Amino acid sequence: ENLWVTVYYGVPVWRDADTTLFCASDAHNVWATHACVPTDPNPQEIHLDNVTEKFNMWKNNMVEQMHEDIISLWDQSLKPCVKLTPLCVTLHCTNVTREGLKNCSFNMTTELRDKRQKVYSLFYRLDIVPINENQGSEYRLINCNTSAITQACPKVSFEPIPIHYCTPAGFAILKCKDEGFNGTGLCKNVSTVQCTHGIKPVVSTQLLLNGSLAEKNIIIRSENITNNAKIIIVQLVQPVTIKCIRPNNNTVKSIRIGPGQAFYYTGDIIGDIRQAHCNVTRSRWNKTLQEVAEKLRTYFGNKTIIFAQSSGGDLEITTHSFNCGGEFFYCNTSGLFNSTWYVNDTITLPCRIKQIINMWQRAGQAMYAPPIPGVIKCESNITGLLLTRDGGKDNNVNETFRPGGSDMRDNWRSELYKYKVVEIEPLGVAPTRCKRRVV
């Protein structure tokens, strides 16, 4: 038979593609969700019968776009806010009478250019570095030698709001529905959505908070489980509740820097001074560690599983950072990772609070969070872990893992692992017996 080319339009095919995604959200937050497109009141999802597709969470560029959007939104929120450049001034400090706080005094500018005022304030020792004169009485803010410091606006909330990511028409997002999935390899159950489920921005360095839970079993994900350089993401079946407190009752005072500006600081503490801390229930955490170890043994030859604290590096690396009440906490997680698991009350984690932060580790940038008055309490769920393998060892007896990861993108991957962006190509051609009639 003589076959002829026939053109079809609306053909159900796609190819992998990278396209600009835009935010959507449920109908002043730092993420500017008011700018986002309202979500559909009844979101659609279409199961694709007989479709098997390859996913790779480590090559996923939705992650790169999310990271750029998170940084860009953060920066936009600081543009109208008060600069603290005038505060880089010699500080004179004494003990508050704990070691974590110093009572500092300094000369600061006023609404009038020719006038000056003396300001008394309390600072966390982490935000304070000694001046090279080394008299022990003179100090400066820690980032004055590396960056301008901008005060976050007190009106701007840092609370996470779920953000749905949507793709342009003519593009679609595939979702993996398999009961367990490594984020790599072939997914048997695939469905199509215009937008992702809402994903909360969460900033953390060792533990993943308030993320998605595994349906049945703990899922361990890595680009290469045998390569110690790679960061291992562990998703938990059940959450472990972590609760945090800042026992100090801070009294917040405000002093004008200049016209249109104000500086917020803790001027006094009511009651005794106590170290901030977070607790994890011991029995629930222990069950979690055992289950993680049981899963790790399936990749590592049933070697004894050892957990250990980070070997070193910056506070941002060695401790668990998070935003609680608008305050930035850094907690010592060695209480969580001290166990050894053979094949055969609560845990209290000390914490520190730092007002000057560099969340994206960018040179030349810094933010000063204003203090939040009164006692601060938070509650969140540990939903996953960031682990690294301690390599360089040939031991066949046991294996060692430590908390933490190389990048913030590792957090975004924990929610986006199941999503893939594809371009829809409605045209196609195929042979038929059909021939066009000509006038």
Partner 1 sequence: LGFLGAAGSTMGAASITLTVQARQIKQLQARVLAVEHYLRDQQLLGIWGCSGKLICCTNVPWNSSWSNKSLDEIWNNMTWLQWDKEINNYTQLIYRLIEESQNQQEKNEKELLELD
Ligand X SMILES: *[C@@H]1O[C@H](CO)[C@@H](O[C@@H]2O[C@H](CO)[C@@H](O[C@@H]3O[C@H](CO[C@H]4O[C@H](CO[C@H]5O[C@H](CO)[C@@H](O)[C@H](O)[C@@H]5O)[C@@H](O)[C@H](O[C@H]5O[C@H](CO)[C@@H](O)[C@H](O)[C@@H]5O)[C@@H]4O)[C@@H](O)[C@H](O[C@H]4O[C@H](CO)[C@@H](O)[C@H](O)[C@@H]4O[C@H]4O[C@H](CO)[C@@H](O)[C@H](O)[C@@H]4O)[C@@H]3O)[C@H](O)[C@H]2NC(C)=O)[C@H](O)[C@H]1NC(C)=O
Ligand Y SMILES: *[C@@H]1O[C@H](CO)[C@@H](O)[C@H](O)[C@H]1NC(C)=O
Ligand Z SMILES: *[C@@H]1O[C@H](CO)[C@@H](O[C@@H]2O[C@H](CO)[C@@H](O)[C@H](O)[C@H]2NC(C)=O)[C@H](O)[C@H]1NC(C)=O
Ligand U SMILES: *[C@@H]1O[C@H](CO)[C@@H](O[C@@H]2O[C@H](CO)[C@@H](O[C@@H]3O[C@H](CO)[C@@H](O)[C@H](O)[C@@H]3O)[C@H](O)[C@H]2NC(C)=O)[C@H](O)[C@H]1NC(C)=O
Residues that bind a second copy (CB under 8 A): 85-86, 88-90, 107, 111-115, 131, 140, 144-145
Smallest CA-to-CA distance from 328 within 376, 282, 396 is with 376
Smallest CA-to-CA distance from 310 within 211, 205, 204, 220 is with 205
Binding mask 10-49 for ligand X (x = CB under 6 A): ---------------------------------------x
For residue 417 the two structure tokens come to 């692992």
* Residues 82, 84: Cα–Cα separation, whole Å: 6
Smallest CA-to-CA distance from 339 within 308, 384, 374 is with 308
**Of the residues 6, 261, 279, 286, which one makes contact with ligand Y according to CB under 6 A:** 286
Binding mask 47-76 for ligand X (x = CB under 6 A): --xx--------------------------
Shortest distance in whole angstroms from residue 185 CB to partner 1: 18
Smallest CA-to-CA distance from 263 within 114, 85, 90 is with 85
DSSP string covering 149-189: -EEPPTT-B-----BEEE--TTEEEEEE--SS--SEEEESS
Binding status of residue 392 toward partner 1 by CB under 8 A: no
Residue ranges in 110-169 that form contacts with partner 1 under rule CB under 8 A: 166-169
Smallest CA-to-CA distance from 305 within 184, 216, 205, 387 is with 387
Stretch that binds partner 1, among 15-23, 132-140, 152-160, 377-385 (CB under 8 A): 15-23
* Residues 302, 307: Cα–Cα separation, whole Å: 15
User: Which residues lie near ligand Z (CB under 6 A)?
Assistant: 224, 226-227, 306, 334-335, 338, 340, 395, 397-398
Binding status of residue 283 toward ligand Y by CB under 6 A: yes
* Residues 331, 278: Cα–Cα separation, whole Å: 7
Of residues 37 and 131, the one with the C-beta less far from a second copy: 131
Shortest distance in whole angstroms from residue 88 CB to a second copy: 6
Stretch that binds ligand Y, among 84-92, 189-197, 255-263, 279-287 (CB under 6 A): 279-287
Residue partners of 386: CB distance under 8 A and separation at least 6: 205, 206, 207, 208, 231, 232, 233, 234, 403, 404, 405, 410, 411
Please say whether the beta carbons of 23 and 35 come within 8 A: yes
What residues pair up with 141 in beta bridges, in sequence order? 128
- Which of ligand Z, a second copy, partner 1, none binds 302 (CB below 5-8 Å, type-dependent)? none
**Of the residues 270, 427, 430, 434, which one makes contact with ligand U according to CB under 6 A:** 270
Q: Using CB under 8 A, list all residues that contact partner 1.
A: 1-14, 19-23, 37, 44, 46-51, 166-172, 192, 423-439
Q: Using CB under 6 A, list all residues that contact ligand Y.
A: 95, 99, 105-107, 210, 239, 282-283, 286, 339, 381
Q: Using CB under 6 A, list all residues that contact ligand X.
A: 49-50
